């Protein structure tokens, strides 16, 4: 448990930010057995940069965008963290509410839909937002799980997950999330329903880009899913019929194609170890119109 501090390049002249800002994370007073510093950008992942100093170079736009940077040191016992941000005099952001539709994977494959109500930009002091779940038809709802989390910038996050009957959601039942706060004049109303309209089966194309001579280690597998309506789609990757972790692949958010529908891109990086095994790599897309079993898949391999 050493002393960890962060120093920021102050303004010059009449309070002008330098064009390049150098944050200096100092970790002092420790027994050196293992040293590891991460530079999270609002919880994300950043590349690489007694007493140790870590340097972070930032542009004007990134610093002025009001983003919190977390310098986290891992010291076996724990994973201590600091925080740094552009500091505003007053006027914190007000309470925000969001409602998320169930994923197609949990709607058609696992048959256990769960809707999530998210309350963000709360206040640590006098924050007791009450979340109420209601239905348009007035039928009783299932028990919901509510959790509270402390973020890096000091604000609170309230997550309420409620399971939804598959038959009720398929028919078109509308669910409503009510957020009530003593200071708030009105109650935050959020509504989630189905995506009515035209339906088209997704078209899935999996492929392997060719090997760059520079790196004989890793291959980039990718999958384009186009011409599907509505925009609710789940993308998965299967290796020898085993689902890979969600952190292995990255899927682009749905975007409306020019002609009639939506298109998404999924990209995954594989090591030569799985490439030598000659296994069949399957890109799978779960969509409401991906008949017959709400699923369309493609397979790629060597050659």
């Amino acid at each position: 448990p050493p002393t960890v501090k962060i120093l920021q390049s102050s303004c010059d002249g009449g309070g002008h930010f330098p064009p390049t800002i150098q944050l200096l994370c100092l970790v002092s007073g420790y027994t050196p057995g293992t040293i590891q510093i991460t530079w999270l950008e609002d919880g994300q992942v950043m590349d690489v940069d007694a007493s140790t100093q870590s340097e972070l170079t930032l542009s004007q736009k990134h610093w002025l965008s009001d983003r919190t940077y977390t310098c986290q040191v891992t010291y076996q016992g724990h994973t201590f963290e600091d925080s740094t941000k552009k500091c505003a005099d007053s006027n914190p952001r007000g309470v925000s509410a969001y409602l998320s539709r169930p994923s197609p994977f949990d709607l058609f494959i696992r048959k256990s839909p769960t809707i999530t109500c998210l309350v963000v930009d709360l206040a640590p002091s006098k924050g007791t937002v009450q979340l109420t779940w209601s239905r348009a038809s007035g039928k009783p709802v299932n028990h919901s799980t509510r959790k509270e989390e402390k973020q890096r910038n000091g604000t609170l996050t309230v997550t309420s997950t409620l399971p939804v009957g598959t038959r009720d959601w398929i028919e078109g039942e509308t669910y409503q999330c009510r957020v009530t706060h003593p200071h708030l004049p009105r109650a935050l109303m959020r509504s989630t329903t189905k995506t009515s309209g035209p339906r088209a089966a997704p078209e899935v194309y999996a492929f392997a880009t060719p090997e760059w001579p520079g790196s004989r280690d890793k291959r980039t597998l990718a999958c384009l899913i186009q011409n599907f309506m509505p925009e609710d789609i789940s993308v998965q990757w299967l290796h020898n019929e085993v689902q890979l972790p969600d952190a292995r692949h990255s899927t682009t958010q749905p975007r409306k194609t020019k002609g009639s529908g939506f298109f998404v891109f999924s990209r995954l990086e594989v090591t030569r170890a799985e490439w030598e095994q000659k296994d069949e790599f399957i890109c799978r897309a779960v969509h409401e119109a991906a008949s017959p079993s709400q699923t369309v898949q493609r397979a790629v391999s060597v050659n």
Binding site: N91, P92, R93, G94, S96, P185, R186
Partner: protein
């Protein structure tokens, strides 16, 4: 006919605010002669000043006063709101004379930034902080729907439309 005045003005108020209604009248028979009427009812106030504190939703409606006998007083409509932004006007039947006052009041005394007033679609005035409208001797064209959009707690909010009529000259004539 006594005239009931509200201190402060802008009968459009928020829940929990303060008003004081008083009809002056030519006479000064305040002692046990002022009867205050809510919607078709009789209140329990005898003084010329009726103070509404912590204005609930039930305190809204039409108010009248009956200082001694006379005939009656002109009813005043008091509306309580609970929105983030409310447009408060000094009067809505304002003559061509006495000025017109507009204010964008947020919930509680919260600072409102980037306040923009509207003039039935066309924006009237934008200011970085909260600002008033003080139209002195409003003419005929100063009528229509008014509402203000602001930024409270770094979030955008919009008020409710308010219809303001200024009417024309009473008689003129003079052959």
């Amino acid at each position: 006919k006594p005239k009931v005045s509200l201190n402060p003005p802008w009968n459009r108020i928020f829940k929990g605010e303060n008003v004081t209604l008083t009809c002056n009248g030519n006479n000064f028979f305040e002692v046990s002669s002022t009867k205050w009427f809510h919607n078709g009812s009789l209140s329990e106030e005898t003084n010329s000043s009726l103070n509404i504190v912590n204005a609930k939703f039930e305190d809204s409606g039409e108010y009248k006063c009956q200082h001694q006998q006379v005939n009656e007083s002109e009813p005043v409509y008091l509306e309580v709101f609970s929105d983030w932004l409310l447009l408060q006007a000094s009067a809505e039947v304002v003559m061509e004379g006495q000025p017109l006052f507009l204010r964008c009041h947020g919930w509680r005394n919260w600072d409102v930034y980037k306040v923009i007033y509207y003039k039935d679609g066309e924006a009237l005035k934008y200011w970085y902080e909260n600002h008033n409208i003080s139209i002195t001797n409003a003419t005929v064209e100063d009528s229509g729907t008014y509402y203000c959009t602001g930024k409270v707690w770094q979030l955008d909010y919009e008020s409710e439309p308010l219809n303001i009529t200024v009417i024309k000259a009473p008689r003129e004539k003079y052959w």
